[PDB]
């Protein structure tokens, strides 16, 4: 299940594996648009706190959902700022969301007291005063309920079928960048004196394998001249020996 778009889920993802590749392996998201820079170039780039904005909207409600655009969903439910380095991922979920009779579990804010602020929502059930005379949380004249039930039926149109939409707003903050992929990690070659680049550790020499028992906290070894002698793998943890090749 997903959330409403008047009240969408702000899933802050930190400490994450290479998964943009999997997001390409899916190849099923209808509106798989990706902003800031083209999606593939965000593959190994790592943000600190990727904000998944999780909700369900309509195929015409996603028309309004775009960086810097307006609309009932983009003004009273989920506004997208123009500056957007994230990634909007919408896919038709008529089979999952909609059930026989109409999936009214999700609601949406057709009208609000005011407009929505970048990357925010409004769960306030307080009945807005559409007109002048007040009602103070009660129903009546010049006041309407802020929440409205979707039409989410199995017979909804392609422009109205319930699209499950996760907006992975990729956020580069000053914290250490957590969520990144392989970071251009090429495959290791063995038994070839080379410049091994082991998490920034630069060094040249014949890279053989090591029987040297590096206790789990021992990634790379060192020598009497602050030179690493026995190293290890970052991706698929495995130990190795070094002998600087012939001068």
């Amino acid at each position: 299940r997903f959330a409403s778009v008047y009240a969408w889920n702000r899933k802050r993802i930190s400490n994450c594996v290479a998964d943009y590749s999997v997001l390409y392996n899916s190849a099923s998201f209808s509106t798989f648009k990706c902003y800031g820079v083209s999606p593939t170039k965000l593959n190994d780039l790592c943000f600190t706190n990727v904000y998944a904005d999780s909700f369900v909207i309509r195929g015409d409600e996603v028309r309004q959902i775009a960086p810097g655009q307006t609309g009932k969903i983009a003004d009273y439910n989920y506004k997208l700022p123009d500056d957007f380095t994230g990634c909007v991922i919408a896919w038709n979920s008529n089979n999952l969301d909609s059930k026989v009779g109409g999936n009214y579990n999700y609601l949406y804010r057709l009208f609000r007291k005011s407009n929505l602020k970048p990357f925010e929502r409004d769960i306030s059930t307080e009945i807005y005063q559409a007109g002048s005379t007040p009602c103070n949380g009660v129903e009546g004249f010049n006041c309407y309920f802020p929440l409205q039930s979707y039409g989410f039926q199995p017979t909804n149109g392609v422009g109205y079928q319930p699209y499950r939409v996760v907006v992975l707003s990729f956020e580069l903050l000053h914290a250490p960048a957590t969520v990144c992929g392989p970071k251009k990690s090429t495959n290791l070659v063995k038994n070839k004196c080379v410049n091994f680049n082991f998490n920034g550790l630069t060094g040249t020499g014949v890279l053989t394998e090591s029987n040297k028992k590096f206790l789990p906290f021992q990634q790379f070894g060192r020598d009497i001249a602050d030179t690493t002698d026995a190293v290890r793998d970052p991706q698929t943890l495995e130990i190795l020996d070094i002998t600087p090749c012939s001068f």
Partner: antibody
Amino acid sequence: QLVQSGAEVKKPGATVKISCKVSGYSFSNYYIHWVKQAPGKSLEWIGYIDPFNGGTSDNLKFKGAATLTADTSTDTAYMELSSLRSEDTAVYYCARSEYDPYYVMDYWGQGTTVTVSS
Amino acid sequence: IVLTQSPFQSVSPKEKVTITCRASQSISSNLHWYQQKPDQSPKLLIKYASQSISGIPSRFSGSGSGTDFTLTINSLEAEDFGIYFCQQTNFWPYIFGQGTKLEIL
């Protein structure tokens, strides 16, 4: 209607920038598909750009750094195809598209071949 | 989202000649059909595989269900036949079928 640049012949390894101008509707509110047509073979969707923002949902079949930029002042979408090679000696088409998943390739450009030789 | 409609055509003209886009298990209601000529920028003939766009003669109709769609060029003459490509939809890789070349007696 979409207009492209004339047929070009380029070198391997380097890059190239093709352009496509638009007239007859609001450019900034209508997507621009880019589609390759192989030499004597079937078609290939190379991607599309949003005219307003960087809506460059890029195909993964070929990663030739075929980036998509645009300019609403002159109403021209630029497809910059890098690492030109024998697999790029095909004819490229800018195409009018829906601003919604109703994506249809109905109004095209003239089609510009980017020939690649030694 | 693979489409393998029909290799090519070889029949007498002015018959209701059918080209059946046998899509994969991706049963997608949306589709499209474009007409490509020898070294000519193609143009979408049948939009959404059910709806007709302005400026297309009714000689080639389009229909279909789920994945399996069809295009019936009824009374196709010696001046209209060419290549006829099927065009995919929402499924993210918008791969187009191998086309339906149309040769007639």
